[PDB]
């Protein structure tokens, strides 16, 4: 009954771990031995795991359970072990772990939305500067440039102060931020947004707010289903019918919301037959004063996907290293650019890795209650004789 | 006698101005009318110039003196005016303005070194992560990601705290920073460095310090002439002779200092016949443990030029938008990269533009005493009848 946390070697930016030091201290308090494979790549230092009770050791052959974040290289797999990561060995997949209602019980929580909102604010500063406008958004870095969300929140506060002081350029007009989805990632992105001088309005007020809104505030709206979903046949919205039959519905976001949106934070988790927020034809419609102080070429400036479908023209993803691309009027995707015409787009598949300490502590909190039954399992013995809960059992891939 | 501050249209990153609001208030207190051409690109907002007493006006035909930072487009030049910028019209060039000893009296001071040191610390974090090592340097953004040097200093303090807590990876070993030059840009880069847990040592101690130095500190050294300059014939250093005859001297930096240097901050202003710090052959010599915690491939990780010659293989410059490049073992320069083998290099020609408010206030402080004689000048009348000081007179290009 020995547990090991393997070293991540997926990519250079995988700095997360499946368990935090406080979780290792709890496991060692229960009487279980924990081996920690040394890793300079981890955002949490090896000495903090040692202080919690873990043993720093390269050879993890003694452990029967090996916990990692991402896939291990196939050659590094040890036979007759139980492995858990994101994908005679028993393999447990975190993403398959669900409760009796089917909701995932082990994830990174809101941190992808927190990181995504910082990134898009940073990207909006660069994009607006490329258009000729210095804004306080120039004073927000990328999410991974901050030690944690607290230090990032202070930077968002400071840029919010500049906006409330009236330091935004008057000619670009009011800024409107639209949040979609009901998951925890949308709550995380809204948490960062609430640190600005924000005012929340209903979707139907965007048309007026986008024109006459106060320039010392930013404006936000939370898009619910009933605001934009209509039946294909007669534009009716029925909550019960849409849940059972989403294929009968379309979205009027492209005409009712999109033209009045400066920045779209898309957190919708796309499912089968769910209507799309924007199509390629919508992008062409959306992309259709003084020399020193020009107006924006288009109202829509940026789109940030934090769900990692809804946006048909967003067929490619960006990375932490190259966070932004432009979708131009010729339907071309220009990678690692904020220049030219078009919409700034950000779609990073591992957002929580930009805030890896808080992402590790959140992931470990969710995983911790299922750890003990994993340690006591035996990969050589049949699955049916293991004392698993349905959460762990149904997550076994082998 | 009307003064105008034109709008900068050089590039998107030219956010500086030749005069700050406090300077405009002084000029208006003297009784002079100041026109401010509106600019969303300026880091200091138009309303702060209005509050100081300036008049926001696109047409600046009334002014006889037009102050800008960089070159104006040739078509925008107005005849029979006096212009001052960096390069029947009279043209004054800031760089030509010198005192009786020949020292420049109008410049951006230390701010290029302040910005350059932040950039290189940010670049070292990315480069070390690419090598497999998470370090606190990941929590320092680019200079232009900070509102001012105060907000940047706080981020350097916070990363310094992490280093003093022991969060650096042990396998990369001690970090040594070498500062060259005696100008104000070197003082600015040292000012940022002093916010880390630093200890200064003599150049001869680098050999030992680079091996056994405390890993909860960073180490710095200031390189003076007598540390590395030797006569070609007999390796003698004579201060008076080197000043008169630098062509008789060479630098032993490549063998005595370079092998023990983690990061070189080059502030030397290169002059005719001054010996080079490093050559192309030196780079080949410099580029000639556990799997989880490897050692550095080479001791030298990064070089940042803040002087904008000394380093023969640094034949190309980087930009604010693409700050870093790699010089590999094949003598190739890989732009916009921190990956692969080689030395990380940063050489931005307009560093102070990354801290444009403080750079503007510094530049304006130096320019302010010469402004009044420029306003009272007449570009149509002969230069010899103008009441100029030698500083302004000798700076006229026409």
Short mmCIF file of N, CA and C in Angstrom, two decimals, chain B residues 268-376:
data_model
loop_
_atom_site.label_atom_id
_atom_site.label_comp_id
_atom_site.label_asym_id
_atom_site.label_seq_id
_atom_site.Cartn_x
_atom_site.Cartn_y
_atom_site.Cartn_z
N UNK B 268 27.31 48.95 -21.91
CA UNK B 268 28.44 49.71 -22.45
C UNK B 268 28.01 50.42 -23.72
N UNK B 269 28.27 51.72 -23.79
CA UNK B 269 28.05 52.49 -25.01
C UNK B 269 29.28 52.34 -25.89
N UNK B 270 29.13 51.62 -26.99
CA UNK B 270 30.27 51.29 -27.83
C UNK B 270 30.79 52.52 -28.56
N UNK B 271 32.11 52.69 -28.54
CA UNK B 271 32.79 53.78 -29.22
C UNK B 271 33.81 53.20 -30.20
N UNK B 272 34.37 54.09 -31.02
CA UNK B 272 35.35 53.68 -32.01
C UNK B 272 36.60 53.13 -31.33
N UNK B 273 37.05 51.96 -31.79
CA UNK B 273 38.23 51.23 -31.29
C UNK B 273 38.04 50.66 -29.89
N UNK B 274 36.82 50.60 -29.39
CA UNK B 274 36.70 49.96 -28.09
C UNK B 274 36.72 48.44 -28.26
N UNK B 275 37.42 47.72 -27.38
CA UNK B 275 37.48 46.26 -27.51
C UNK B 275 36.11 45.63 -27.28
N UNK B 276 35.91 44.48 -27.91
CA UNK B 276 34.64 43.77 -27.83
C UNK B 276 34.59 42.89 -26.59
N UNK B 277 33.39 42.75 -26.01
CA UNK B 277 33.23 41.87 -24.86
C UNK B 277 33.29 40.41 -25.26
N UNK B 278 32.55 40.03 -26.31
CA UNK B 278 32.51 38.66 -26.80
C UNK B 278 32.51 38.67 -28.32
N UNK B 279 33.15 37.65 -28.89
CA UNK B 279 33.20 37.45 -30.34
C UNK B 279 32.41 36.20 -30.71
N UNK B 280 32.33 35.94 -32.02
CA UNK B 280 31.64 34.74 -32.49
C UNK B 280 32.35 33.48 -32.05
N UNK B 281 33.69 33.50 -32.04
CA UNK B 281 34.45 32.34 -31.59
C UNK B 281 34.25 32.10 -30.10
N UNK B 282 34.07 33.18 -29.32
CA UNK B 282 33.77 33.03 -27.90
C UNK B 282 32.44 32.31 -27.70
N UNK B 283 31.44 32.61 -28.54
CA UNK B 283 30.14 31.97 -28.38
C UNK B 283 30.24 30.46 -28.60
N UNK B 284 31.04 30.04 -29.58
CA UNK B 284 31.23 28.61 -29.82
C UNK B 284 31.88 27.94 -28.62
N UNK B 285 32.83 28.62 -27.98
CA UNK B 285 33.46 28.06 -26.78
C UNK B 285 32.46 27.96 -25.63
N UNK B 286 31.60 28.97 -25.47
CA UNK B 286 30.62 28.96 -24.39
C UNK B 286 29.49 27.97 -24.66
N UNK B 287 29.21 27.67 -25.93
CA UNK B 287 28.17 26.72 -26.30
C UNK B 287 28.72 25.33 -26.57
N UNK B 288 29.99 25.09 -26.26
CA UNK B 288 30.62 23.80 -26.54
C UNK B 288 30.03 22.70 -25.66
N UNK B 289 22.35 16.05 -14.14
CA UNK B 289 22.18 15.07 -13.08
C UNK B 289 21.00 14.13 -13.29
N UNK B 290 20.01 14.22 -12.40
CA UNK B 290 18.83 13.36 -12.51
C UNK B 290 17.99 13.76 -13.72
N UNK B 291 17.19 12.81 -14.21
CA UNK B 291 16.30 13.10 -15.33
C UNK B 291 15.29 14.18 -14.96
N UNK B 292 14.78 14.13 -13.73
CA UNK B 292 13.81 15.13 -13.31
C UNK B 292 14.42 16.49 -13.03
N UNK B 293 15.68 16.52 -12.61
CA UNK B 293 16.34 17.75 -12.20
C UNK B 293 17.69 17.87 -12.89
N UNK B 294 17.70 18.12 -14.19
CA UNK B 294 18.97 18.27 -14.91
C UNK B 294 19.66 19.58 -14.55
N UNK B 295 20.95 19.62 -14.88
CA UNK B 295 21.74 20.83 -14.76
C UNK B 295 21.60 21.65 -16.04
N UNK B 296 22.01 22.92 -15.97
CA UNK B 296 21.97 23.75 -17.17
C UNK B 296 22.89 23.17 -18.24
N UNK B 297 22.54 23.30 -19.52
CA UNK B 297 23.47 22.86 -20.57
C UNK B 297 24.72 23.73 -20.63
N UNK B 298 24.56 25.03 -20.40
CA UNK B 298 25.68 25.95 -20.31
C UNK B 298 25.41 26.92 -19.17
N UNK B 299 26.49 27.45 -18.59
CA UNK B 299 26.34 28.40 -17.50
C UNK B 299 25.65 29.68 -17.97
N UNK B 300 26.06 30.21 -19.12
CA UNK B 300 25.47 31.43 -19.66
C UNK B 300 24.10 31.13 -20.25
N UNK B 301 23.07 31.82 -19.75
CA UNK B 301 21.69 31.60 -20.14
C UNK B 301 21.16 32.74 -21.01
N UNK B 302 21.50 33.99 -20.67
CA UNK B 302 20.87 35.13 -21.32
C UNK B 302 21.83 36.32 -21.40
N UNK B 303 21.62 37.15 -22.42
CA UNK B 303 22.33 38.42 -22.59
C UNK B 303 21.30 39.48 -22.95
N UNK B 304 21.28 40.58 -22.21
CA UNK B 304 20.38 41.69 -22.50
C UNK B 304 21.19 42.95 -22.76
N UNK B 305 21.04 43.51 -23.95
CA UNK B 305 21.71 44.76 -24.30
C UNK B 305 20.76 45.91 -23.99
N UNK B 306 21.18 46.80 -23.09
CA UNK B 306 20.38 47.97 -22.74
C UNK B 306 20.96 49.26 -23.32
N UNK B 307 22.12 49.20 -23.98
CA UNK B 307 22.73 50.39 -24.57
C UNK B 307 22.14 50.72 -25.94
N UNK B 308 21.69 49.72 -26.68
CA UNK B 308 21.12 49.90 -28.02
C UNK B 308 22.09 50.60 -28.97
N UNK B 309 28.15 45.62 -31.48
CA UNK B 309 29.36 46.30 -31.04
C UNK B 309 30.14 45.54 -29.98
N UNK B 310 29.69 45.63 -28.73
CA UNK B 310 30.34 44.92 -27.64
C UNK B 310 30.25 43.41 -27.83
N UNK B 311 29.17 42.94 -28.44
CA UNK B 311 28.92 41.51 -28.63
C UNK B 311 28.80 41.26 -30.12
N UNK B 312 29.83 40.64 -30.69
CA UNK B 312 29.96 40.58 -32.14
C UNK B 312 28.83 39.77 -32.78
N UNK B 313 28.40 38.68 -32.12
CA UNK B 313 27.35 37.84 -32.70
C UNK B 313 25.95 38.43 -32.55
N UNK B 314 25.79 39.54 -31.85
CA UNK B 314 24.49 40.20 -31.74
C UNK B 314 24.37 41.26 -32.84
N UNK B 315 24.20 40.78 -34.07
CA UNK B 315 24.14 41.65 -35.24
C UNK B 315 22.73 42.10 -35.59
N UNK B 316 21.71 41.50 -34.99
CA UNK B 316 20.32 41.88 -35.23
C UNK B 316 19.67 42.28 -33.91
N UNK B 317 18.61 43.07 -34.03
CA UNK B 317 17.89 43.58 -32.87
C UNK B 317 16.54 42.90 -32.74
N UNK B 318 16.04 42.84 -31.51
CA UNK B 318 14.69 42.39 -31.23
C UNK B 318 13.77 43.60 -31.05
N UNK B 319 12.48 43.33 -30.91
CA UNK B 319 11.48 44.39 -30.76
C UNK B 319 10.65 44.13 -29.51
N UNK B 320 9.85 45.14 -29.13
CA UNK B 320 8.94 44.98 -27.99
C UNK B 320 7.99 43.82 -28.24
N UNK B 321 7.48 43.72 -29.47
CA UNK B 321 6.50 42.69 -29.81
C UNK B 321 7.12 41.30 -29.81
N UNK B 322 8.38 41.19 -30.25
CA UNK B 322 9.12 39.92 -30.29
C UNK B 322 10.43 40.13 -29.55
N UNK B 323 10.42 40.03 -28.21
CA UNK B 323 11.54 40.53 -27.41
C UNK B 323 12.80 39.66 -27.38
N UNK B 324 12.68 38.37 -27.64
CA UNK B 324 13.78 37.44 -27.41
C UNK B 324 14.11 36.65 -28.68
N UNK B 325 15.39 36.32 -28.83
CA UNK B 325 15.82 35.39 -29.86
C UNK B 325 16.90 34.49 -29.26
N UNK B 326 17.18 33.38 -29.95
CA UNK B 326 18.21 32.44 -29.53
C UNK B 326 19.35 32.47 -30.53
N UNK B 327 20.58 32.48 -30.02
CA UNK B 327 21.78 32.30 -30.83
C UNK B 327 22.29 30.89 -30.57
N UNK B 328 22.21 30.02 -31.58
CA UNK B 328 22.47 28.60 -31.38
C UNK B 328 23.94 28.26 -31.63
N UNK B 329 24.25 26.96 -31.58
CA UNK B 329 25.61 26.48 -31.80
C UNK B 329 26.02 26.55 -33.26
N UNK B 330 25.07 26.61 -34.18
CA UNK B 330 25.34 26.76 -35.61
C UNK B 330 25.46 28.22 -36.03
N UNK B 331 25.57 29.14 -35.06
CA UNK B 331 25.65 30.58 -35.31
C UNK B 331 24.42 31.10 -36.06
N UNK B 332 23.27 30.49 -35.81
CA UNK B 332 22.00 30.95 -36.36
C UNK B 332 21.22 31.73 -35.31
N UNK B 333 20.53 32.77 -35.74
CA UNK B 333 19.67 33.56 -34.87
C UNK B 333 18.23 33.12 -35.12
N UNK B 334 17.60 32.58 -34.08
CA UNK B 334 16.22 32.11 -34.15
C UNK B 334 15.35 33.17 -33.49
N UNK B 335 14.53 33.85 -34.29
CA UNK B 335 13.75 34.98 -33.80
C UNK B 335 12.47 34.52 -33.11
N UNK B 336 12.07 35.29 -32.09
CA UNK B 336 10.83 35.05 -31.35
C UNK B 336 10.81 33.63 -30.78
N UNK B 337 11.90 33.26 -30.13
CA UNK B 337 12.03 31.91 -29.59
C UNK B 337 12.84 31.95 -28.30
N UNK B 338 12.50 31.04 -27.39
CA UNK B 338 13.33 30.70 -26.24
C UNK B 338 13.71 29.23 -26.24
N UNK B 339 13.38 28.50 -27.29
CA UNK B 339 13.55 27.06 -27.36
C UNK B 339 14.91 26.69 -27.94
N UNK B 340 15.23 25.40 -27.86
CA UNK B 340 16.44 24.90 -28.47
C UNK B 340 17.68 25.18 -27.64
N UNK B 341 18.83 24.97 -28.27
CA UNK B 341 20.10 25.22 -27.62
C UNK B 341 20.52 26.67 -27.85
N UNK B 342 21.52 27.12 -27.09
CA UNK B 342 22.06 28.45 -27.31
C UNK B 342 21.84 29.46 -26.21
N UNK B 343 22.03 30.74 -26.53
CA UNK B 343 21.96 31.84 -25.58
C UNK B 343 20.73 32.68 -25.89
N UNK B 344 19.94 32.97 -24.86
CA UNK B 344 18.81 33.88 -25.02
C UNK B 344 19.33 35.30 -25.15
N UNK B 345 18.83 36.03 -26.15
CA UNK B 345 19.32 37.37 -26.42
C UNK B 345 18.16 38.34 -26.54
N UNK B 346 18.34 39.54 -25.99
CA UNK B 346 17.34 40.61 -26.01
C UNK B 346 18.06 41.92 -26.32
N UNK B 347 17.60 42.63 -27.37
CA UNK B 347 18.27 43.86 -27.80
C UNK B 347 17.22 44.77 -28.45
N UNK B 348 16.47 45.48 -27.62
CA UNK B 348 15.37 46.31 -28.08
C UNK B 348 15.85 47.75 -28.20
N UNK B 349 15.55 48.39 -29.34
CA UNK B 349 16.06 49.72 -29.63
C UNK B 349 15.29 50.84 -28.93
N UNK B 350 14.07 50.59 -28.47
CA UNK B 350 13.26 51.62 -27.81
C UNK B 350 12.73 51.08 -26.48
N UNK B 351 13.65 50.61 -25.64
CA UNK B 351 13.27 50.14 -24.31
C UNK B 351 12.44 51.14 -23.52
N UNK B 352 12.79 52.44 -23.43
CA UNK B 352 11.99 53.35 -22.58
C UNK B 352 10.53 53.45 -22.98
N UNK B 353 10.19 53.12 -24.23
CA UNK B 353 8.79 53.12 -24.66
C UNK B 353 7.95 52.08 -23.92
N UNK B 354 8.58 51.11 -23.25
CA UNK B 354 7.83 50.13 -22.47
C UNK B 354 7.38 50.69 -21.13
N UNK B 355 8.01 51.77 -20.66
CA UNK B 355 7.60 52.49 -19.45
C UNK B 355 7.37 53.94 -19.84
N UNK B 356 6.36 54.20 -20.68
CA UNK B 356 6.32 55.49 -21.40
C UNK B 356 5.97 56.68 -20.53
N UNK B 357 5.25 56.51 -19.43
CA UNK B 357 4.92 57.66 -18.58
C UNK B 357 6.17 58.17 -17.87
N UNK B 358 6.90 57.27 -17.20
CA UNK B 358 8.12 57.66 -16.52
C UNK B 358 9.19 58.10 -17.52
N UNK B 359 9.22 57.49 -18.70
CA UNK B 359 10.17 57.91 -19.72
C UNK B 359 9.83 59.30 -20.24
N UNK B 360 8.54 59.62 -20.34
CA UNK B 360 8.12 60.94 -20.81
C UNK B 360 8.46 62.02 -19.79
N UNK B 361 8.21 61.74 -18.51
CA UNK B 361 8.48 62.71 -17.45
C UNK B 361 9.97 62.96 -17.32
N UNK B 362 10.79 61.92 -17.46
CA UNK B 362 12.23 62.09 -17.42
C UNK B 362 12.73 62.89 -18.62
N UNK B 363 12.30 62.51 -19.83
CA UNK B 363 12.72 63.24 -21.02
C UNK B 363 12.31 64.70 -20.94
N UNK B 364 11.07 64.96 -20.50
CA UNK B 364 10.59 66.33 -20.42
C UNK B 364 11.33 67.16 -19.38
N UNK B 365 11.73 66.54 -18.27
CA UNK B 365 12.51 67.26 -17.26
C UNK B 365 13.82 67.78 -17.85
N UNK B 366 14.47 66.97 -18.68
CA UNK B 366 15.74 67.38 -19.28
C UNK B 366 15.53 68.43 -20.37
N UNK B 367 14.45 68.29 -21.14
CA UNK B 367 14.18 69.22 -22.23
C UNK B 367 13.62 70.55 -21.75
N UNK B 368 12.89 70.55 -20.63
CA UNK B 368 12.16 71.73 -20.17
C UNK B 368 12.97 73.02 -20.14
N UNK B 369 14.20 73.07 -19.61
CA UNK B 369 14.89 74.37 -19.52
C UNK B 369 15.23 74.98 -20.87
N UNK B 370 15.33 74.19 -21.93
CA UNK B 370 15.64 74.70 -23.25
C UNK B 370 14.41 75.02 -24.08
N UNK B 371 13.21 74.80 -23.53
CA UNK B 371 11.99 74.94 -24.32
C UNK B 371 11.73 76.40 -24.67
N UNK B 372 11.87 77.31 -23.69
CA UNK B 372 11.47 78.70 -23.89
C UNK B 372 12.26 79.36 -25.02
N UNK B 373 13.57 79.11 -25.10
CA UNK B 373 14.35 79.69 -26.18
C UNK B 373 13.96 79.10 -27.53
N UNK B 374 13.42 77.88 -27.53
CA UNK B 374 12.94 77.29 -28.77
C UNK B 374 11.63 77.94 -29.22
N UNK B 375 10.73 78.20 -28.28
CA UNK B 375 9.46 78.86 -28.61
C UNK B 375 9.72 80.24 -29.20
N UNK B 376 10.65 81.00 -28.61
CA UNK B 376 10.92 82.36 -29.06
C UNK B 376 11.73 82.42 -30.35
#
